[PDB]
Amino acid sequence: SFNKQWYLLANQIIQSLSKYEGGHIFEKLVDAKKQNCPDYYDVIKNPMSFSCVKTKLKKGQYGLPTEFIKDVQLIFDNCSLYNTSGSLVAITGKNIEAYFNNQLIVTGYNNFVTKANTIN
Numbered sequence: 001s002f003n004k005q006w007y008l009l010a011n012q013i014i015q016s017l018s019k020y021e022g023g024h025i026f027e028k029l030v031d032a033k034k035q036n037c038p039d040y041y042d043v044i045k046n047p048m049s050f051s052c053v054k055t056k057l058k059k060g061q062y063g064l065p066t067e068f069i070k071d072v073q074l075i076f077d078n079c080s081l082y083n084t085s086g087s088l089v090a091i092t093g094k095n096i097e098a099y100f101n102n103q104l105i106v107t108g109y110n111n112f113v114t115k116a117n118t119i120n
């Protein structure tokens with residue numbers, strides 16, 4: 001099935017981001033008290049983590065392959081927003097984002113995006 005394939009591909013891609021060096025910081029949502037950042041959810045109004053994306057792929061919340069890309073990019077956009085350009089967190093965010101964008105090409109996930117935009 002069309003939706004079954006890019007669901008499978010999105011699961012493999014999000015799993016590789018979780019195994020990427022330093023990717024564990026994007027796995028779960030930030031605990032404001034534990035991570036010593038009490039203003040995180042005053043700055044980030046649309047939080048997103050790898051586990052959030054995995055749940056949506058598990059429950060079947062995505063209707064279009066672009067919805068997966070937007071949630072993942074939201075993680076890296078929240079990262080570059082709250083974290084200073086040179087910090088350790090921002091560095092790893094830029095690293096995984098570059099890895100994620102290259103995976104969308106080598107896995108062919110963009111092909112599901114291209115065919116989906118013409119359908120709609």
Ligand SMILES: Cc1[nH]c(-c2cccc(NS(C)(=O)=O)c2C)c2c1C(=O)CCCC2
Binds near residue numbers: 024079
């Ligand atoms: C996307 C993101 N993730 C994390 C995070 C979460 C759990 C554990 C760790 N690791 S640790 C060794 O406790 O510092 C980090 C960095 C943070 C973060 C931020 O936006 C900055 C503020 C909180 C740190």
